Amino acid sequence: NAPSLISILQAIEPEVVYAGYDNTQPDTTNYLLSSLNRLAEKQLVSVVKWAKALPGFRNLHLDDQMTLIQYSWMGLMAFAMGWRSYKHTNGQMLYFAPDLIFNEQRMQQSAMYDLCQGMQQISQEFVRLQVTQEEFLCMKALLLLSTVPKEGLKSQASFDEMRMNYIKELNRAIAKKENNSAQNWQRFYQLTKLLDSMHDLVGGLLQFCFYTFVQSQALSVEFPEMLVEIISAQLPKVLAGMAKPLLFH
Amino acid sequence: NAPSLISILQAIEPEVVYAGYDNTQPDTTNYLLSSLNRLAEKQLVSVVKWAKALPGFRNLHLDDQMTLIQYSWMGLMAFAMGWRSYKHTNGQMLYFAPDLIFNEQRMQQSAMYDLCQGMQQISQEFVRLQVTQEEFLCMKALLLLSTVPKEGLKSQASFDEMRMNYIKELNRAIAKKENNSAQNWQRFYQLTKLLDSMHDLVGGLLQFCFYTFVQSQALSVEFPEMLVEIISAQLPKVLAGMAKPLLFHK
Ligand SMILES: CC(=O)[C@H]1CC[C@H]2[C@@H]3CCC4=CC(=O)CC[C@]4(C)[C@H]3CC[C@]12C
Ligand SMILES: CC(=O)[C@H]1CC[C@H]2[C@@H]3CCC4=CC(=O)CC[C@]4(C)[C@H]3CC[C@]12C
């Protein structure tokens, strides 16, 4: 056979990115929120390299490629962050970058606190289910494919296929580790139910992101160049409500 | 909107068939089996009427239609039978027809007794699960679609899509109960798992049917005309192993 896409997912998985954060700084709301936005920009390049290499993706209309990234960029970063929080801190802390990690204090100072808790719960869920690296990588792919234009895509031809495979390949992963079907059947629930749960969270994250952005002047936080563009394009579409989450349940 | 798949399903559900059995007769292996085979013929005709009226069915290539039936005819009848046995006897007895119902003694004389038990366990599942009539109708539609030719279908064009609709429809039916996603997922698991259990049973039934078919002279068990051909046509394909059951997990 040809290489399993899972084996390719592993190959194209990005290496971790540093924030270039200065940890001697007092933890100040504005400074935290801004360095986070710096991090996002760096990660934004990473996730885009990734999606390109992501099998099936290039075969979508570039307006399709462009929209999917626009919607899901937040969820993918947040999801991946929760998986780092799990491997490194055991869901105890929010591990954004090896050099910027949110302890309790920082979550309170972020003025994102309730949103931080929410992200943390995603991480703890990872530790509760003991998600395997394979499960994670498949899930993260599906996340990309889990929010779509309310009016459907140009490549919907290609898309519905791709989405199916990554669902299939997710099954291939739940099946391999475990053995019994009663088990497979419930794994699949808990995992997909985890993916679904991401949507509500992202909404909240976005809500605040948008807010910080519009009020960036007043609040005095900085969104860097590349980051603005993406938000700028996304903000209107999602407020228009052209963005449809695809649930499992 | 346009009428529910499930509302059509209900419309086209066959009325119950009578066997025309003389219950004053003694309960004897040959008269019992022969009488079932008469019942199987009568049901056979309505099963086919049913499948035609089944939405998305006539859109399948006509070889696919004939194939699928030959495969699942046994499972449909036995599935339906266990449903009746749940509705009328509460899983207690085997209600093939209102006039011919197997109680313990008849399962003894049947000389299929371990199979009778098997079928009695299907109905008992219906009762353990408290299956709704809507759940039942969707499952029975799928049962048609759950054993396919191993080589594939001429138009798998349509089939795959149709099969999904009935799966969606089945979810539409579980959801109605107003449960949450986890209960729904659990209903779904336990239904399709009742479904899948059907093959094991049916395999066994086919076997003893094939047997009684061949040995009828020996056994003095008479297969009405129309029952004969379907078996004639099916038996080869089966023993060649060209029939692939479609499961919901191993
Ligand atoms: C400054 C601001 O509005 C906050 C709101 C939500 C925050 C983001 C939440 C998800 C997250 C995961 C990461 O790995 C770093 C960047 C991001 C993408 C965060 C960057 C800073 C954000 C953008
Ligand atoms: C004589 C014989 O081979 C028996 C073996 C199993 C029996 C069948 C079991 C399933 C059953 C359900 C019905 O409602 C009547 C017909 C049938 C289809 C039965 C017809 C007679 C059978 C076929």
Author numbering:
A (entry chain B): -1 to 247
B (entry chain A): -1 to 248
The article reads:
SRs are hormone-activated nuclear transcription factors with distinct specificities for endogenous steroid hormones and exogenous substances. In all SRs, the activating hormone binds in an internal cavity within a well-conserved ligand binding domain (LBD), causing the LBD to change conformation, attract coactivator proteins, and increase transcription of target genes. AncSR1 is the last common ancestral protein from which the entire SR family descends by a series of gene duplications; AncSR2 is the ancestral protein of all naSRs. In contrast, AncSR2 was completely unresponsive to estrogens (and cholesterol) but strongly activated by low concentrations of diverse nonaromatized steroid hormones, including progestagens and corticosteroids and – to a lesser extent – androgens.
We first used X-ray crystallography to determine the structures of bacterially expressed AncSR2-LBD in complex with progesterone and with 11-deoxycorticosterone (DOC), at 2.75 and 2.82 Å resolution, respectively. The structures reveal why AncSR2 did not yet distinguish between progestagens and corticosteroids, which differ only in that the latter contain a 21-hydroxyl. The two protein backbones have nearly identical topologies (RMSD = 0.28 Å), and there are virtually no differences in the ways the ligands are bound. The AncSR2-progesterone complex contains ample room to accommodate the additional 21-hydroxyl of corticosteroids. Further, Asn35 offers a perfectly positioned hydrogen bond partner, which is unpaired in the AncSR2-progesterone complex, for DOC's hydroxyl. Second, AncSR2 evolved an additional criterion: it prefers steroids with a 17β-acetyl group (such as progestagens and corticosteroids) to those with smaller hydroxyls or ketones (androgens and estrogens), as demonstrated by the 21- to 87-fold difference in EC50 values between pairs of hormones that differ only at this position. AncSR2 does not distinguish strongly between progestagens and corticosteroids because it has only a weak preference for steroids with a 21-hydroxyl.
